[PDB]
Design a protein around this ligand. Structure first.
Ligand SMILES: Nc1ncnc2c1ncn2[C@@H]1O[C@H](COP(=O)(O)OP(=O)(O)NP(=O)(O)O)[C@@H](O)[C@H]1O
Ligand SMILES: Nc1ncnc2c1ncn2[C@@H]1O[C@H](COP(=O)(O)OP(=O)(O)NP(=O)(O)O)[C@@H](O)[C@H]1O
Ligand SMILES: [K+]
Ligand SMILES: [K+]
Ligand SMILES: [Mg+2]
Ligand SMILES: [Mg+2]
Lengths: 87, 381, 383, 87
């Protein structure tokens, strides 16, 4: 059976933004994620934005590294599992 | 559609505003500024800035929302949003679409001319009822610095566009790039601000103190101090401070043809441009300083309203600067305006609505982490 | 008993510390300063102040707590708690119990004499490993101001007892009420602090700025400005500020020889006593002012360490004052000590453990409140 | 569903405190009480202490009004019930 996981696709943070740079990860692998927490820093050509979590869970694996330039929208960034039984 | 306004808010509120440096404003109005990119930018950015702040309006207590004045400006922000959205699917490169766009910006600028006295009226009409409670007071203060700074930024973008792209026959200056002066004589702005203030004072008191200026340039010992800035913003701050200084100077000497001058000190280093305004107007006790930047305190129930200080500080903060007050009770007061010396560092200071902004309205009365003493302290003798 | 230490902490940390006015201190050391009431008060209050802050020591990140230096002061506080606790059920009106109580306080003061440099070493030991961490920064910063202020107040209370009761007979100031001067010559303290700093300056640079002193008594035009204060607290603040201004003046006059004086302004109002120290030492950019009061910023990896500023501020904050700085980069800097003019208003500022303090520890990393600009801004320049 | 409630008695906020003045009720009749919130302001002759909620529930009635001087230790002040069905 597959664990009830959540997925984090990259959204448009500016209305014309189609792609953005992943500055740095503010939550490492295995950390809890309460709604509101600063997950990572996303930098476009217009702004640097604090990307926040919307649903509770844990950081399981990073898919897109730090410093990675111009990642398109809808692209998964990390996997979130609602259960602790992955560490 | 008016009916669909709440979703338009939720859509644009999700995005982040885009802070612009003064360098960017200056490079755009380079040689031949392109109305297209200004159109396609503002067409989107202004919804964003409107939507973000509007989402914060509906978070302040219902007691403030219910008042005619707060609700009057709310309805303005609704309209300006829809007006600008009517351009979203519009075609650039078609001069008609651009020409009527700047006209819409003119209309929006006129609609919003009296936002400042009106929002101040709402908080007054709020104080006319519920009065005081720390949980409401804190939220309003947090909201107003954000709301007013936001307005300055919206008025900035509109003023840049219209000045550049409207009315080619000449008012304006215009060695200026919109409202920005690339070679702004700091001293002159000081003298101008002093002239207007000395005028008002000289006729509301029939006495005014002189001015003394001094400049220290650390980058270039001799060179007069200049900067890339918006003279209006600078003038507004200085003008407001001069009034306070003159009033207090005149009201503390209460018997003098021997008024001590207001001294100005302008300094420029590698990073800061600093303007210090010293007066010997008798000063203010320290516990009262922090109160002078409170919106609810300087409103009841030369010197007009009470929003001169808080608002001038927001001008100073808008391009990553500050406005700091420090006195000595019984002597006088220094007021310092701090501005970045480099157009690269002069970046827009804008509020973003987000989860982080949401929780600032959603706090309650806590105990202090410090000891409050007894109101009737034990007789130790 | 050492085993029960955690429950003694839990007992006394539940209580709220008792802040005193300088009026209260002064009025107590009146004529028959009642040792019985000072002993019974302190016998209770000191453990209250100790337990409250120790509760907060235990709430800092384990990476800090683990360091030998932190635990060395943690061991000092645990002992001090106990040494005092062995007096709780002792009998007043017995000179033996009183006499050995002041002896115990003297020992505590000798034990805690190096607390400042030692807590500073622990942070340094923390800095020589995990380095920097935004959330960890906040917690250490929040803790240090409180820890150090808690300390000053404990020193205060101890010194009051010892200086009054017969841990003196010859060596003190036979006019002071404890450490408190009821008619403290503000100007003389300024001159004293100047004299030492100048001395250290001349013996480390061979050049020194002069002193210019001015006074404005707005309460009595002609009167020399006096107040009820602890001159040593005042001394500490000015001695520190003077050194900072002297370094700055000499270092920023690489072409000079002809040093611009340090100007002092002492103003007294109905409520404030303000001391402004002005220097023409080249100033500090605004974004660096905030850093100057950070404990984790001024430490690596006249100018000794980097705790003179944050600590002097605490001294000023202790009796409801403040110390503020405002420079102008390229010209110089103004530092200002604010003091309450009246001894009624001079009330102890004391940290308090409670749910409110607890929540200031273990806090999350938040998204920005305002816009953060891009590192590489969009070039909006034309073709 | 007829329970034995939770009672709020005045504690020693200072070790030598024998009585206290109930200065300022920061929670009104029929409010949410989470463990830790500021319930009221209690002032002795040595300090003004913020009295915090220990047990979770809801405030239903107040026995000691605002401004009542010299209230002794162990004195009932207000009533706590776990269920909010008392409004
Ligand atoms: N230089 C100064 N000296 C003494 N008091 C001052 C000074 N500047 C400000 N204040 C005090 O701060 C209060 C608020 O100032 P400000 O915000 O400028 O409003 P205002 O001067 O009262 N009138 P307005 O500026 O028309 O809103 C003043 O009423 C003064 O009491
Ligand atoms: N008047 C001043 N002018 C310019 N820079 C100053 C001034 N005062 C402080 N600073 C700066 O702030 C720091 C002083 O902080 P402080 O806490 O006094 O530590 P310190 O003077 O370096 N050594 P110490 O105080 O002996 O521990 C220095 O790094 C200076 O660069
Ligand atoms: K947003
Ligand atoms: K406590
Ligand atoms: Mg004014
Ligand atoms: Mg120093």
């Amino acid at each position: 059976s597959y664990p009830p996981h959540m997925q984090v696709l990259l959204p448009a943070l500016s209305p014309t933004m189609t792609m953005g740079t992943v500055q740095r990860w503010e939550k490492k692998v295995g950390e809890k994620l309460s709604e509101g927490d600063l997950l990572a820093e996303i930098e476009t050509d217009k702004a640097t934005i604090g990307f926040e979590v919307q649903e509770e869970g844990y950081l399981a694996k990073i898919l897109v590294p730090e410093g990675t330039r111009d990642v398109p929208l809808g692209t998964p960034l990390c996997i979130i599992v609602e259960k602790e039984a992955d560490i | 559609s008016l009916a669909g306004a709440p979703k338009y808010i939720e859509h644009f509120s999700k995005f982040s505003p885009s802070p612009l440096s003064m360098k960017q404003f200056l490079d755009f109005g380079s040689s031949n500024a392109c109305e297209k990119t200004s159109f396609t930018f503002l067409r989107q950015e202004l919804p964003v800035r409107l939507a973000n702040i509007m989402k914060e309006i509906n978070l302040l207590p219902d007691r403030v929302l219910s008042t005619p004045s707060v609700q009057l400006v709310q309805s303005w922000y609704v309209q300006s949003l829809l007006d600008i959205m009517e351009f979203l699917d519009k075609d650039p490169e078609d001069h008609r679409t651009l020409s009527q766009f700047t006209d819409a910006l003119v209309t929006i600028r006129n609609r919003h001319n009296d936002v400042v006295p009106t929002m101040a009226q709402g908080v007054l009409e709020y104080k006319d009822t519920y009065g005081d409670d720390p949980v409401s007071n804190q939220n309003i203060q947090y909201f107003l610095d954000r709301f007013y700074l936001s307005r300055i930024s919206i008025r900035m973008l509109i003023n840049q566009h219209t000045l550049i792209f409207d009315g080619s026959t000449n008012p304006a200056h215009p060695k200026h790039i919109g409202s920005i002066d690339p070679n702004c004589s700091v001293s002159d702005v000081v003298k101008d601000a002093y002239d207007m203030a000395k005028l008002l004072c000289d006729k509301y008191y029939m006495a005014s103190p002189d001015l003394e200026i001094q400049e220290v340039n650390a980058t270039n010992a001799t060179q007069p101090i200049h900067m890339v800035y918006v003279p209006s913003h600078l003038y507004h701050m200085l003008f407001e401070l001069f009034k306070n200084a003159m009033r207090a100077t005149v009201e503390s000497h209460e018997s003098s043809l021997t008024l001590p001058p207001i001294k100005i000190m302008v300094a420029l280093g590698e990073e800061d441009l600093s303007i210090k305004m010293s007066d010997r107007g008798g000063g203010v006790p320290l516990r009262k300083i922090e109160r002078l930047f409170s919106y609810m305190y300087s409103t009841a129930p030369l010197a007009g309203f009470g929003y001169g200080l808080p608002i001038s500080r927001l001008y100073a903060k808008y391009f990553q600067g500050d406005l700091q007050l420090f006195s000595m009770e019984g002597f006088g007061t220094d007021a310092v305006i701090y501005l970045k010396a480099l157009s690269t560092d002069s970046v827009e200071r804008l509020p973003v609505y987000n989860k982080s902004a949401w929780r600032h309205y959603q706090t309650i009365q806590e105990a202090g982490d410090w000891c409050v003493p007894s109101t009737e302290p034990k007789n130790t003798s």
